[PDB]
RNA sequence: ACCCCUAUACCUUCUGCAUAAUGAAUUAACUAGAAAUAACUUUGCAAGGAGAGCCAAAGCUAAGACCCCCGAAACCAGACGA
RNA sequence: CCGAGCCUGGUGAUAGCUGGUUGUCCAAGAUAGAAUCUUAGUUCAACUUUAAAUUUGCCCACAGAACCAAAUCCCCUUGUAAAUUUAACUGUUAGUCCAAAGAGGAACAGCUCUUUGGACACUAGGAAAAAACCUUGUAGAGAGAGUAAAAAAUUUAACACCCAUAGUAGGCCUAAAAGCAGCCACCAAUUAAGAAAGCGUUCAAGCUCAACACCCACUACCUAAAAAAUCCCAAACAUAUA
RNA sequence: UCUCUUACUUUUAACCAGUGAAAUUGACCUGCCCGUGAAGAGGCGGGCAUAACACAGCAAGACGAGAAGACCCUAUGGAGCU
RNA sequence: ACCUCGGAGCAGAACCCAACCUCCGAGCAGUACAUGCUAAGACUUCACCAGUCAAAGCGAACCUCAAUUGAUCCAAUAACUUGACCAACGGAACAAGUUACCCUAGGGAUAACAGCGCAAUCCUAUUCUAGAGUCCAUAUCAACAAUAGGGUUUACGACCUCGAUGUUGGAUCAGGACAUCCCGAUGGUGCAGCCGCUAUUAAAGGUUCGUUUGUUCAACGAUUAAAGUCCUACGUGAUCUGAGUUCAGACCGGAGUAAUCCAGGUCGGUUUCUAUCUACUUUAAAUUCCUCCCUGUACGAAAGGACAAGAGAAAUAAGGCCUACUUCACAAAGCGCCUUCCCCCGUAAAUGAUAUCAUCUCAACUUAGAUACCCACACCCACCCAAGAACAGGGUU
């Protein structure tokens, strides 16, 4: 019968070769996930549809910020075949109140806090 | 050329967050800037909400980390408070 | 009598070598209801080390057992719960020795 | 001359379909995206004991907002201005 | 259909794609490794014997010589006290180049045989070789000097 | 205007109808959702309400708003028919 | 139109059965089951709809659920916003394929029966046409753009050359069984031949192999079909930088 | 009767003139092959064919027309008989 | 056959979970006589009804079992209580057969024919090499078993059709497949010849008349070169038949109290349609047998006895014509006459490499290996015609 799948922790242990394959330091882990739904919830079970609705990924190709905490990670572990997960990188730090209206997310996943629309 | 645009960092659709789609369409001939476009106002509002969400989650998790730190601090003070109130006697 | 794949059906020994039995043993094993083969101790060990060597030097980054156990792409919707232990080498009563 | 018995894609005898190069490449692309997901879920920030109660206040206040709305559901006011406004449908010049 | 059938069941197309992706890929060598770069000792004892003694050596070509004819030839040649040795070339040549009879070396090609004794008696060698006409007397040596068949005949007469 | 491209009439019935299942030539006209018990909404008055009778530990009074058409073979009564 | 005339009335007989049921626009909306003269129906539940009141509802951490597999139950966080109760009712309760675990049958069926999960009975693109397979859902106008799924690959069978006397018609059994009907042993001469591996003889006799020599070298890809009935079915193309 | 059918006449027939029905009919601008599909396609897919329009003939198809199947099953539907 | 209740599997681990699924049972017995009363909290057979456990308290003392069962009305009784194999077990207080004399409302939700699915059964091919064939697996046949294919049988399923898809055989006309019955070509033989057996290739052409039976079939008679196997809605009833089969009449045997019935026999029994659409309505190369000679030759001990080459004579099929015959008569016909022309591929050989031999070669290579018909074109009112339904066509000097 078809039922929910328990994914092994051996799957979710990273390896050094994976680390230089997708450069991310094990110490000082990244703080926020950029999660983007890249597949339909149709022809999928109702629990996966429910977890997509819980995570707020109803619209495809719309990035969303989630915490890098074990509970949110467990939800993403359930629904990992319909999404793309990237780390949220902050080159110029967290946005301030004076820089709230000039932000952009960009394709590389870097939340810049100054968007000028001018050439370098 | 979506993959090439992703490699250069300029989204994948050319109609996304670029100068071509985010600069004003027109302005008055005397030089007065046009009122802002509806799509650009909407997009700026969504980006504002996104950035406020980013700040809120980061500070909430930070506060959770220091709350755990001070909790553990109160834990090891209470195990380090282990002075015997009474000096042992008898067979000593 | 049920017979599963990888089970010796008959055993022979004595003061003989492989080819002598191998003739009529291939003759019988061709007539069996399933796929069968005349094997020796040496040939059975050789095929097992061959399968392990193919599994070791497989250059495909993706394997059936990795995808199935990690539930990659939601493939357990079209797989079976027995495929987690068969690892794609078995399909019904059929054994595919080319699968790694 | 060549017909599949019954319906094409159901039953004991089906029309065969074969895997093309682009179908294989599409699947391999999706496999790579999920290996990326595996890595980024493999690195967590906090632990469960550190996470235990960090958003309880915000979740509680969100639910109090929901309760406040669901309780404040109630009929609207009524207006002398609206009734005497309906008197205007016979407003003539002279 | 059941999960077990007497015929190969048609897979779900996603499972078929799964098998096609997870097929086995062998390692490819870069520059193709194919394109990349007993009896001898005992036979040395008897040849060392028959060249240290037995100073009449005669080389003949081993003509077919059907078994009754061969054995009867063996018997008159033994009645007249010579031996018929059959030693293979693959061990007899290297003994020649390291045992100084390199002038008798280029003669042991094809089927070969040795008429060998300690006594000179090339007279019935030549009469038995004239009784059987297809028998060449290829060559040999008498008293450690090389001699052709014209050698053998003027040492005879 | 055609030529190019897209495109398996409608209703009913059904698990599913382009179905080679049903009905229909077409026009005009005629031809098929009736109401109580309660509930809800809006008024009036209020420990009472209703122009007797009735109901009432906020109720009572008034209004609004909800329930189709065609079709058997038959059964009985009284006549009319050799 | 006599298995019981015809007419009128009761009569607008009755029909769990068929047919039909008339303006516009928007919204929510898909099937556990139990009883039943019941399985072509109905009532209750379940789901669904509306209106209210209230506070938790889904996802779930560790610990925990029995002796004789996939999973589930329970469940704090966390992610989210729904859930229960109260009031009032309809309708659905004749179900299809696919994946999985099974049962019946032929380890038949576009077969039948349960269970878990999809999709279909709702849109669009693809697999040729197309219900159920894959992609994708929330609605409009555009003579803009990035994509998802998405096009089947295979073509198989050459194998040596040359040579061969003989202890013996080894012994036993048999008329003979001689290497070769069946038994015991399996030594032994020549340089090198099994008391013989196939044939072949009533038995004999014969001819091939294993053996000398010979020599370049055993060259050794270890693989395998075909049929039906109107008329084959896109046209084609191995070679211009993913 | 048939082997094995032939010839003639009358009726019918076809043409001119007069009078003038019926069953049927969703709309039709109404092709062939193979495949598909509610499993037997004029209408779907791939190919092929293709100026338009009368008159006579044929009966392979339009699951052709007619009669809410004369068999079978169902109905808490009838009826006759024992 | 079953209908109610319980245990085990299916249903492996909270619960639940079906089949005319696989097994086992139940419709009580035994003890007690506080098996009294009362009452928080719960469980629940997926609803309800029904069912289940129980703290405390009063009063005493100091139930086992798995199912072991039956609602309401009503009846009995002073009361407490007690009443159905109501077993169709959520139970109507009490009612059987038969209908082909049948009727109605519906159903392709459901059977018969046909299509479709499937291939158990049926049919074929290969693989293996036991065995048979004096010896010899493989001239021929073939066990156990394996692989693959067909969709002709009997089923199985219930998907289209019950506001009709008319049915078995027969006539008429046949279209197609080849798994070939004859004719053609070839390989093997336990092939001397004649005959055979088996295999490869070949679907242009052909494949009879009768007696019994409704028969498909089957048997028999007489032939032939052969008297093929199938599919086509078991081809074909708006082209025909109606012998059979399953309407109303009747008889015999049997069954039943009877009505009536029999997957038994027998005699009789209405087969409608004026064609709207599609499609179609004149596409010249023919096969086979027999006779003679070859020839009593080849071959063979004899008995027997060819193949090629050639000549003739027919038969059928296609096309046409009336000189005679015959039906008949300005003519149409056959029973009469005339004409009728190509191959066809299985394999057998030569040279010759990969592999200095050899080798027919998915090596390069060599050999066995159509013409005919038609063809011009506003004389046209009208007449005639060997031309013709109308139209068209030919003649009118
Ligand atoms: C055609 N005939 C042989 C027939 C057959 C059957 N039965 C079948 O349907 C059988 N067909 C199978 C073989 C099952 C395919 C039949 O059932 C019938 C009939 C005949 C009819 C005659 C009817 C007749 N009318 C309608 C023309 C009539 O007026 C009378 C009468 N005597 O008054 C009838 O009897 C009649 O109505 C009738 O009963 C018939 C059939 O029932
Ligand atoms: Mg089909
Ligand atoms: Mg149906
Ligand atoms: Mg359709
Ligand atoms: Mg039609
Ligand atoms: Mg119909
Ligand atoms: Mg219709
Ligand atoms: Mg109907
Ligand atoms: Mg009645
Ligand atoms: Mg009278
Ligand atoms: Mg009515
Ligand atoms: Mg909606
Ligand atoms: Mg009932
Ligand atoms: Mg009913
Ligand atoms: Mg089904
Ligand atoms: Mg007229
Ligand atoms: Mg068709
Ligand atoms: Mg016509
Ligand atoms: Mg009807
Ligand atoms: Mg009923
Ligand atoms: Mg309950
Ligand atoms: Mg107590
Ligand atoms: Mg009952
Ligand atoms: Mg009951
Ligand atoms: Mg009768
Ligand atoms: Mg009727
Ligand atoms: Mg049938
Ligand atoms: Mg034998
Ligand atoms: Mg069914
Ligand atoms: Mg019908
Ligand atoms: Mg009809
Ligand atoms: Mg009809
Ligand atoms: Mg053939
Ligand atoms: Mg028929
Ligand atoms: Mg017809
Ligand atoms: Mg009748
Ligand atoms: Mg009569
Ligand atoms: Mg007729
Ligand atoms: Mg038509």
């Amino acid at each position: 019968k078809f039922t929910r799948s328990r994914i092994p922790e051996k799957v979710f242990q990273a390896s050094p070769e994976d680390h230089e394959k997708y450069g991310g330091d094990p110490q000082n882990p990244h703080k926020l996930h950029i999660v983007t739904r890249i597949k339909s919830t149709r022809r999928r079970p109702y629990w996966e549809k429910d977890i997509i609705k819980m995570l707020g990924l109803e619209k495809a190709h719309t990035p969303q910020v989630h915490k890098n905490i074990p509970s949110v990670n467990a939800k993403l572990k359930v629904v990992k075949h319909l999404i793309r997960i990237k780390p949220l990188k902050l080159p110029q730090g967290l946005p301030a109140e004076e820089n709230m209206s000039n932000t952009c997310l960009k394709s590389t996943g870097e939340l810049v806090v100054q968007w000028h629309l001018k050439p370098v | 050329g979506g993959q090439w645009r992703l490699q250069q960092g300029l989204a994948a659709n050319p109609s996304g967050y670029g100068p071509l789609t985010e600069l004003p369409d027109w302005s008055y001939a005397d030089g007065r800037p046009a009122p802002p476009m509806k799509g650009q106002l909407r997009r700026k509002a969504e980006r504002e909400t996104f950035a406020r969400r980013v700040v809120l989650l980061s500070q909430e998790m930070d506060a959770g980390l220091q709350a755990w730190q001070l909790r553990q601090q109160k834990l090891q003070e209470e195990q380090r408070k282990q002075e015997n109130a009474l000096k042992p006697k008898g067979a000593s | 009598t049920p017979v599963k794949a990888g089970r010796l059906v008959v055993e022979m020994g004595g003061r003989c070598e492989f080819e002598e039995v191998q003739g009529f043993l291939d003759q019988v094993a061709h007539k069996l209801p399933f796929a069968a083969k005349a094997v020796s101790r040496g040939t059975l060990e050789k095929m097992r080390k061959d399968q392990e060597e193919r599994e070791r030097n497989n250059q495909n980054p993706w394997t059936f057992e990795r995808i199935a156990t990690a539930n990659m792409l939601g493939i357990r919707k079209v797989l079976s719960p027995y495929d987690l232990t068969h690892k794609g080498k078995y399909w019904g009563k059929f054994y595919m020795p080319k699968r790694v | 001359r060549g017909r599949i018995p019954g319906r094409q894609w159901i039953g004991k005898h089906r029309r065969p379909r074969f895997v093309s190069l682009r179908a294989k490449q599409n699947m391999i692309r999706r496999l790579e995206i999920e290996a990326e997901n595996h890595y980024w879920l493999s690195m967590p920030y906090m632990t469960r004991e550190q996470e235990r109660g960090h958003a309880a206040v915000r979740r509680r206040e969100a639910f109090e907002a929901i309760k406040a709305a669901a309780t404040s559901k109630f009929p609207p006011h009524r207006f002398i201005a609206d009734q005497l406004d309906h008197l205007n449908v016979t407003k003539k010049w002279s | 259909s059941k999960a077990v059938t007497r015929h190969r069941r048609v897979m779900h197309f996603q499972r078929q794609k799964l098998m096609a992706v997870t097929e086995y890929i062998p390692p490819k060598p870069a520059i193709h490794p194919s394109c990349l770069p007993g009896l001898i000792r005992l036979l040395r004892r008897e040849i060392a014997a028959v060249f240290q003694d037995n100073r009449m050596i005669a080389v003949c070509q081993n003509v077919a010589l059907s078994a009754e004819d061969k054995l009867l030839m063996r018997h008159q040649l033994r009645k007249h006290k010579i031996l018929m040795k059959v030693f293979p070339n693959q061990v007899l040549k290297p003994f020649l180049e390291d045992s100084k009879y390199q002038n008798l070396l280029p003669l042991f090609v094809g089927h070969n045989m040795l008429l060998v004794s300690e006594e000179p008696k090339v007279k019935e060698m030549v009469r038995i070789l004239r009784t059987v006409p297809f028998l060449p007397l290829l060559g040999g040596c008498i008293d450690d000097t090389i001699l052709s068949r014209q050698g053998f005949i003027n040492y005879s007469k």
Side-chain angles (χ1 to χ4, degrees), chain A residues 27-43:
Chain A
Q27 294 82 17
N28 297 115
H30 75 283
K31 173 137 42 187
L32 297 178
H33 293 304
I34 301 299
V35 176
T36 293
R37 186 175 62 91
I38 64 158
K39 208 175 180 185
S40 184
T41 62
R42 301 288 294 164
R43 326 186 102 93

Side-chain angles (χ1 to χ4, degrees), chain C residues 70-81:
Chain C
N71 191 34
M72 282 215 88
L73 320 174
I75 208 69
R76 211 182 290 183
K77 195 185 186 231
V78 307
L79 293 194
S80 171

Side-chain angles (χ1 to χ4, degrees), chain E residues 66-83:
Chain E
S66 166
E68 69 275 16
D69 291 331
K70 173 76 69 65
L71 270 300
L72 64 85
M73 299 325 100
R74 292 220 81 188
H75 189 35
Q76 69 272 15
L77 271 60
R78 184 87 162 278
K79 277 208 293 287
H80 293 87
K81 273 75 68 178
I82 189 168
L83 305 168

Side-chain angles (χ1 to χ4, degrees), chain E residues 116-150:
Chain E
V116 286
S117 79
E118 293 87 29
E119 61 87 20
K121 185 174 75 175
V122 298
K123 277 73 69 177
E124 73 275 14
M125 281 75 76
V126 301
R127 64 200 150 260
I128 298 167
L129 280 70
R130 65 179 64 89
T131 61
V132 60
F134 42 86
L135 185 64
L137 187 67
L138 201 74
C141 63
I142 313 298
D143 291 331
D144 291 331
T145 182
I146 51 161
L147 295 172
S148 64
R149 79 172 296 267
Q150 291 81 17

Side-chain angles (χ1 to χ4, degrees), chain C residues 16-34:
Chain C
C16 65
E17 295 170 15
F18 187 33
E19 313 91 326
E20 299 181 358
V21 298
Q22 174 191 32
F24 54 91
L25 289 196
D26 281 329
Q27 163 164 9
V28 173
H30 162 256
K31 295 180 77 174
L32 289 203
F34 38 79

Side-chain angles (χ1 to χ4, degrees), chain B residues 29-72:
Chain B
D30 58 78
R32 280 172 302 123
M37 312 216 278
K38 309 293 188 293
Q40 178 71 15
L41 294 174
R42 184 190 91 255
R43 214 169 308 117
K44 264 204 186 185
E46 321 195 9
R47 293 213 272 261
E48 201 176 20
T49 317
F50 188 85
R52 294 196 175 297
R53 183 175 165 86
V54 165
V55 170
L56 172 81
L57 280 70
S58 184
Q59 304 180 288
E60 211 166 30
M61 272 166 28
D62 273 358
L65 261 183
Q66 282 95 21
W68 182 80
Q69 282 301 139
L70 281 71
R71 208 201 290 98
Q72 295 293 127

Side-chain angles (χ1 to χ4, degrees), chain D residues 8 12 15 20 22 30 52 55-56 58-59 73:
Chain D
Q8 271 175 104
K12 203 187 166 160
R15 170 176 147 211
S20 58
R22 59 170 166 190
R30 287 217 152 76
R52 182 133 291 282
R58 182 185 48 77
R59 300 183 59 245
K73 191 168 85 181

